[PDB]
Amino acid sequence: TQLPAGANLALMVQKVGASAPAIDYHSQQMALPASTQKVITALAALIQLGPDFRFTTTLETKGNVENGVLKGDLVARFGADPTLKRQDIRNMVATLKKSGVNQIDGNVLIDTSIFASHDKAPGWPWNDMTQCFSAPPAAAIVDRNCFSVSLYSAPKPGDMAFIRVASYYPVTMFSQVRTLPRGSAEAQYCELDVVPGDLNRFTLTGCLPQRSEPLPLAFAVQDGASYAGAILKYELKQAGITWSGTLLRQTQVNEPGTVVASKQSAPLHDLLKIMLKKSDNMIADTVFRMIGHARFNVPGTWRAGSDAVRQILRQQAGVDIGNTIIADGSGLSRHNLIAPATMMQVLQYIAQHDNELNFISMLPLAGYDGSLQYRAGLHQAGVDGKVSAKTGSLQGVYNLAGFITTASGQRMAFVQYLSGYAVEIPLVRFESRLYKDIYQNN
Numbered sequence: 001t002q003l004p005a006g007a008n009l010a011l012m013v014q015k016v017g018a019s020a021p022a023i024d025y026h027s028q029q030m031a032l033p034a035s036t037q038k039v040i041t042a043l044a045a046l047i048q049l050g051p052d053f054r055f056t057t058t059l060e061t062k063g064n065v066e067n068g069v070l071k072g073d074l075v076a077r078f079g080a081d082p083t084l085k086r087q088d089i090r091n092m093v094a095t096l097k098k099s100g101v102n103q104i105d106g107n108v109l110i111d112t113s114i115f116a117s118h119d120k121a122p123g124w125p126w127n128d129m130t131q132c133f134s135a136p137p138a139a140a141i142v143d144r145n146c147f148s149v150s151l152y153s154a155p156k157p158g159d160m161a162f163i164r165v166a167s168y169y170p171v172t173m174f175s176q177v178r179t180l181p182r183g184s185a186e187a188q189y190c191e192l193d194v195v196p197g198d199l200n201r202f203t204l205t206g207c208l209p210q211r212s213e214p215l216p217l218a219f220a221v222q223d224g225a226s227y228a229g230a231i232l233k234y235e236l237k238q239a240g241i242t243w244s245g246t247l248l249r250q251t252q253v254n255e256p257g258t259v260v261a262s263k264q265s266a267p268l269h270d271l272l273k274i275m276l277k278k279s280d281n282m283i284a285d286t287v288f289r290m291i292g293h294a295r296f297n298v299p300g301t302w303r304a305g306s307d308a309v310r311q312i313l314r315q316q317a318g319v320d321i322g323n324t325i326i327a328d329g330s331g332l333s334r335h336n337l338i339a340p341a342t343m344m345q346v347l348q349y350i351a352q353h354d355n356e357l358n359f360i361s362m363l364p365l366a367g368y369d370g371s372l373q374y375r376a377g378l379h380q381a382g383v384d385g386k387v388s389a390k391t392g393s394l395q396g397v398y399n400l401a402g403f404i405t406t407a408s409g410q411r412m413a414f415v416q417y418l419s420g421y422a423v424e425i426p427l428v429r430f431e432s433r434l435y436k437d438i439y440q441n442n
């Protein structure tokens with residue numbers, strides 16, 4: 001340990017297929033897994049949904065089309081596809097038009113019944129909810145439910161800073177930001193804040209020091225259904241389709257209408273690969289609630305996802321996670337809690353079934369891709385191209401979970417759970433020593 005005063009390490013290193021570990025340091029102690037949770041999410045997803053699962057979104061008609069008039073409702077059934085884009089909506093609407101519908105004598109329903117309850121997992125800090133990495137992974141996603149904004153200081157200090165936003169983003173921005181004389185010391189404790197409101201309103205408050213250039217800001221959409229509905233409304237109007245009713249949310253499970261247009265995501269194995277390479281929280285969390293929906297045939301919720309993942313691990317993978325707490329798929333939640341010894345059983349299962357799962361090729365390869373392209377510790381250990389592992393990074397948490405091929409060619413699984421990390425290169429020195437050790441001595 002080259003580690004800062006008071007950091008907490010739980011570490012286990014074990015040959016693939018071996019029954020005893022080579023390194024065992026507090027391996028039974030529960031810890032915050034952060035994004036290494038995604039290893040569990042990917043395995044349960046492959047087992048439950050399979051590599052060829054695709055998310056799907058449809059436009060459905062309920063009623064007869066007479067003389068180009070739908071006598072009934074248009075239903076836009078969202079399916080938690082994390083990769084759905086504005087263009088996909090525009091294309092599905094183009095297809096609707098081409099099918100013969102010019103007018104809807106009825107309502108436009110934004111159907112999110114695939115999921116229920118909150119779009120935010122237990123244990124997610126409230127303060128990060130407006131940041132894109134923590135965007136609520138709702139059933140209705142368009143362009144990752146993230147949008148950007150430019151904040152301009154006013155030429156006269158004391159005047160309102162002003163917001164520029166692209167006109168297509170259906171959000172409502174208000175500025176209550178005071179522009180400060182670019183020296184004086186309201187600047188020290190006057191915060192610049194974002195305050196979300198209902199229906200995708202955002203108010204910027206506080207102070208902004210004079211700047212020559214505008215401040216770029218990216219925010220998370222809080223109400224995906226409303227956002228997706230406004231985009232749909234816009235695309236309908238552009239395509240010349242009129243309607244007499246209003247846009248309504250449909251949350252209760254219901255029989256599908258006639259599918260007039262659809263979009264399916266890339267295959268799940270492809271999505272899980274992005275997820276593990278890049279640590280994509282939104283893919284992990286839409287997958288997570290999908291798992292529960294598919295296993296129990298109920299609208300997907302965080303609790304059903306948690307129950308399902310535990311059941312899948314125990315029953316299909318032979319891993320009893322015991323008192324482990326699984327709160328989400330991404331590892332964002334501070335309620336996730338698992339011991340290296342438990343994550344080790346998952347890793348051993350994966351290595352044993354890797355020819356079936358094609359799992360290890362999806363993990364970041366040190367020195368090549370994803371989160372490990374340049375991890376100084378690993379590069380300096382001389383283990384580039386020898387480590388395939390998932391990172392887990394949160395405020396003062398630096399985890400790694402995966403596989404290393406050692407100097408003798410032995411594959412070893414490892415779990416490094418390092419937290420309570422706080423500062424007044426210790427990591428880099430720690431990692432370069434440890435992985436050089438593991439590689440060289442095994």
Ligand SMILES: *C(=O)[C@@H](NC(=O)COc1ccccc1)[C@@H]1N[C@@H](C(=O)O)C(C)(C)S1
Pocket residue numbers: 034035036133278279280281330331332371391392393394395396
């Ligand atoms: C998994 O650990 C995820 N981490 C987060 O969502 C939040 O990450 C941080 C928050 C505060 C301070 C430091 C990190 C995913 N892994 C991250 C990573 O850096 O790879 C991420 C930001 C891409 S999200």
